[PDB]
């Protein structure tokens, strides 16, 4: 079948959270939670849907009542910002399964606002013809700030691309880019790349491309 | 029933675990009483019950509370369990006040710490010897079960297709191989001649015990739920 | 209140007498005594009860009759067979308190004899797995003191006695068996008053 | 020191066939039962399958996603399982984990894993593009300078982005890669005080394991 969890998560360091994987056939099978890391590795928090195993942190319980286990992260730390995953079994030959996986982000305080910085095409990379216009965006929390470009104070919607990556312990960043026919920046006039850092209403402009 | 019936008569359990044991006493009889039997054979006094849930108290454990219905169903309520409490949990009924009690068949459950330590045995048939035969004039087959943990089995011997006990003999305890594995072994014995016969059979069955329904097995390995094993053999070696 | 009875094993020989001693302790006047056997494997049944003070209360060979004067319900029986091998439990119930008073328990263990004992020790082997070191001993005296295991991997059961199809005497037996693939029948059963037989395999 | 090593991951057109191994390391391989599961890249974990050992016929079970083209098979003399894959589809480019399962153990060591790539598209090798400022747009708080290198052009498995090789690890930013008409891109920052660049180097070393991308791109000022 299916197993449920929640798309995501959120518990302020100190406190503890919750994360429920409703699994049908749960009071048939065992269940098991997973954690990965940026990095992409692999931990088993928990099995046996209530038992850890040495060497992780106590604060990671596991109960399990009916048709739910449980993960409980008791006074949530920062270090545990990543990806959880709930396993288990279905069917006669008790065929494995994992959840949607949760993403728990842990929120600290330090309120840290934007710190953008524009980058005009290469001159090889316009040798081909090609303009791409690199803006960035560092240490900022928490809030996803939608960085979104402006031709002459008219917002731009083609050939864009971003992300909102998050790292360097307590340090979100983002890489918001932007290709553009080099006879388009040529003959462009004020590339711009407005970021929207949660709280507040920010607009770090730093409208950029004028210079040459 | 004018038989006192008991069930389950097997259950397996981790520590914390909770289960729930139930009687059926003898029709008619009013008065019921939960009997445990613990290492050796030491009947202790629990709770005692007559007619309906009226009670004269005993060692029965706050964790377990059993009550009467009104078909006289009783149940005793295993909650918490611990490898102490590892027993034989036999019902007892009897009519009015002061006369001959009645033995159910018992509850004979087993409190783990590690449920993934149970597992089923091993049987194996070894044939008589030439010399005992030749010698003595006589056939015996020896079975040995081994390597099982939770000593919940018994060993039956089947000689075509018929179950027998003429001339069986199965260990009376099973044994300690180690501090996790046990061991039953019996024999048997037949006429030189009848051995010797091809067109014979010879069967050792080891009913094991393991969980069930409940069965919270360690998704790593197979569940080791009760069941048959056996081994087999036919007559005279040909030569 | 109380109801004491014998402690010991009673190990007995087929034939021979038998008396489990059985006394009791109560405040209230006692309505009837009761002697369980239960058997291997199975729950305790009653083997006979009582309530008149001299009733040679008699069952499948069993007999016992209670004496209050002295407070006894002694159990005994002239003939024993081997089917008598159990447990079992004195007990009665008593007014007043109601209470119905158990014992601690007495085993018994009713050993063959042997008419011409042929102590002799084979080693029996698995055509399924290749590793196989079994040893039976058969036909030797009921009053032997088999040996015991004296290293790991090995293992030394006890004495059992077997009565194939009613035809004639039965048989004590005793296996071994052991990892130590280097040992023989004479070695895992050491102290050997026994013929090893054994030999090459014709054809 | 239990190791488990997955091998085999490549990338490969689509509708074809891929048999990547797992190796074993640190144990009995002889009591484990051992799985396969794979993982798109936002994609969560996805189980593949499993293959119990001898005593249990070594009886394989496969995920419904490819039971009828996914197929595993062990090899106890190498103490390895391996996985034959078939009429492969891009929505099977996933990095593949193999893991075990014993009587006490389970699911406790994880391979790093094997990438493998199913589209119809070729091994582009990436193009670096340094990126400088130094624009004075008036309202400069230049505290720090930051710059990096624009890697754009590749799109097989993750590349490497070192700085004055290694030597400047802190201030450096490497984000996340980026899917742009099937090929990838990405940037790696990095920020010193004013007055340490102009004069001493700030060379990024970008690699790419797909094609020897043995490149280094000592950033002049404009
Ligand atoms: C048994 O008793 C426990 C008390 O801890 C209770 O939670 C449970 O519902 C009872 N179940 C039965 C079948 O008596
Ligand atoms: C379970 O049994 C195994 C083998 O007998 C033993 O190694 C282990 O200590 C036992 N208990 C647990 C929790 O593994
Ligand atoms: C197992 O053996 C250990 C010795 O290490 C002993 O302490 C323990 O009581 C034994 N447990 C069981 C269930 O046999
Ligand atoms: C196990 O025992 C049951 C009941 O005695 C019998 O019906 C069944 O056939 C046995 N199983 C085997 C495999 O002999
Ligand atoms: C009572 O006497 C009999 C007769 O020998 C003996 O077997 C029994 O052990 C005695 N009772 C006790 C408690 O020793
Ligand atoms: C053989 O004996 C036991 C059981 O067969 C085994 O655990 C042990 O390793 C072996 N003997 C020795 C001395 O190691
Ligand atoms: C040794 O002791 C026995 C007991 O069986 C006696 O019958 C006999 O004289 C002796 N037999 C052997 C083989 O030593």
């Known amino acids: 079948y299916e197993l449920i969890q929640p798309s995501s998560a959120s518990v302020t360091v100190g406190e503890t959270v919750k994360i429920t994987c409703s699994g049908d056939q749960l009071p048939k099978n065992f269940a098991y939670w997973f954690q990965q890391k940026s990095d992409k590795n692999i931990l088993l928090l928990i099995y046996?849907?209530?038992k850890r195993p040495s060497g992780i942190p106590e604060r990671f319980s596991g109960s399990t009542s009916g048709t739910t286990a449980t993960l409980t992260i008791s006074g949530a730390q920062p270090e545990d910002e990543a990806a959880y995953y709930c396993?288990?079994?279905?069917?006669?030959?008790?065929?494995?399964?994992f959840g949607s996986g949760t993403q728990l982000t842990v929120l600290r305080g330090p309120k840290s606002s934007p710190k953008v910085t524009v980058f005009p095409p290469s001159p090889e990379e316009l040798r081909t013809n090609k303009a791409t216009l690199v803006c960035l965006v560092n240490d900022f929390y928490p809030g996803s700030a939608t960085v979104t470009w402006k031709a002459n104070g008219a917002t731009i919607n083609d050939g864009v691309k971003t992300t909102k990556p998050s790292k360097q312990g307590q340090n979100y960043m983002t890489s918001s880019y932007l290709s553009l026919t080099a006879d388009q920046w040529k003959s462009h006039n004020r590339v711009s790349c407005q970021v929207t850092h949660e709280g507040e209403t920010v607009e770090k402009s730093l409208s950029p491309a004028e210079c040459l | 029933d004018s038989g006192v019936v008991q069930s389950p008569r097997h259950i397996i359990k981790e520590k914390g675990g909770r289960s729930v044991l139930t009687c059926i006493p003898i029709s008619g009889h009013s008065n019921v009483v939960w009997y445990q039997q613990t290492l050796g054979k030491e009947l202790k006094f629990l709770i005692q019950h007559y007619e309906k849930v009226e009670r004269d108290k005993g060692f029965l454990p706050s964790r377990f509370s059993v009550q009467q219905f009104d078909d006289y169903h009783s149940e005793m309520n295993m909650s918490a369990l611990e490898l102490e409490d590892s027993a034989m949990y036999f019902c007892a009924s009897s009519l009015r006040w002061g006369d001959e009690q009645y033995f159910g068949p018992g509850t004979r459950l087993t409190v783990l710490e590690d449920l993934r330590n149970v597992t089923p045995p091993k049987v194996s048939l070894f044939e008589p010897s030439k010399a005992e035969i030749a010698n003595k004039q006589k056939a015996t087959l020896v079975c040995l079960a081994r390597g099982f943990f939770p000593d919940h089995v018994e060993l039956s011997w089947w000689v075509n297709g018929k179950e027998v006990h003429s001339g069986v003999s199965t260990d009376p305890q099973a044994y300690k191989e180690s501090n996790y594995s046990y061991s039953l072994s019996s024999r048997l014995r037949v006429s030189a001649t009848f051995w010797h016969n091809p067109r014979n059979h010879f069967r050792c069955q080891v009913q094991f015990h393991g969980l069930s329904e409940e069965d919270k097995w360690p998704e790593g390995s197979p569940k080791p739920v009760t069941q048959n094993i056996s081994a087999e053999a036919w007559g005279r070696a040909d030569c | 209140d109380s109801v004491t009875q014998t402690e010991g094993l009673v190990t007995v020989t087929e034939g021979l007498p038998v008396k489990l001693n059985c006394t009791y302790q109560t405040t209230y006047l006692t309505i009837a005594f009761f002697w369980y056997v239960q058997y291997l494997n199975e729950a305790p049944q009653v083997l006979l009860k009582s309530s008149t003070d001299n009733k040679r209360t008699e069952h499948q060979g069993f007999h016992a009759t209670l004496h209050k004067s002295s407070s006894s319900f002694h159990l005994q029986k002239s003939s024993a067979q081997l089917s008598d091998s159990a447990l079992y439990y004195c007990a009665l119930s008593e007014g007043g308190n109601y209470k119905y008073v158990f014992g601690a328990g007495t085993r018994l263990k009713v050993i063959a004899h042997i008419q011409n004992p042929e102590p002799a020790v084979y080693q029996l082997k698995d055509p399924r797995s290749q590793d196989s070191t079994l040893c039976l001993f058969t036909d030797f005296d009921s009053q032997i003191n088999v040996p015991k295991t004296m290293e790991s991997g090995t293992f030394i059961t006890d004495k059992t006695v077997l009565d194939m199809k009613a035809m004639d005497s039965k048989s004590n037996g005793a296996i071994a068996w052991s990892n130590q693939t280097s040992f023989t029948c004479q070695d895992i059963f050491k102290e050997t008053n026994a013929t090893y037989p054994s030999s090459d395999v014709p054809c | 020191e239990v190791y488990l090593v997955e091998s085999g991951g490549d990338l490969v057109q689509p509708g074809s066939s891929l048999k990547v191994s797992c190796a074993a390391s640190?144990?009995?391989?002889?009591?484990?039962?051992m799985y396969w599961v794979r993982q798109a890249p936002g994609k969560g974990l996805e189980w593949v399958g499993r293959?119990?050992?001898?005593?249990?016929?070594?009886?394989?079970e496969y995920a419904d996603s490819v039971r009828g083209r996914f197929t595993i098979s062990r090899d106890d003399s190498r103490n390895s399982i391996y996985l034959q894959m078939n009429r492969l589809r891009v929505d099977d480019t996933a990095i593949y984990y193999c893991?075990?399962?014993?009587?006490?153990?389970?699911?406790?060591?994880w391979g790093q894993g094997t990438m493998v790539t199913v589209s119809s598209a070729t091994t582009t090798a990436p193009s670096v593009y340094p990126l400088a400022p130094a624009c004075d747009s008036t309202t400069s708080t230049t505290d720090t300078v930051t710059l990096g290198c624009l890697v754009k052009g590749y799109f097989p498995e993750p590349v490497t982005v070192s700085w004055n090789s290694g030597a400047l690890t802190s201030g450096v930013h490497t984000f996340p890669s980026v899917l742009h008409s099937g090929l990838y891109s990405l940037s790696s920052s990095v920020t010193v005080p004013s007055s340490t660049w102009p004069k001493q180097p700030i060379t990024c070393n970008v690699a790419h394991p797909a094609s020897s991308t043995k490149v280094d791109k000592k950033i002049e000022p404009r």
């Open positions: 396993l288990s079994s279905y069917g006669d030959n008790n065929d494995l399964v």
């Open positions: 893991t075990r399962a014993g009587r006490f153990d389970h699911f406790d060591y």
């Open positions: 640190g144990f009995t391989f002889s009591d484990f039962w």
């Open positions: 293959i119990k050992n001898i005593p249990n016929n070594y009886a394989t």
């Open positions: 046996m849907d209530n």
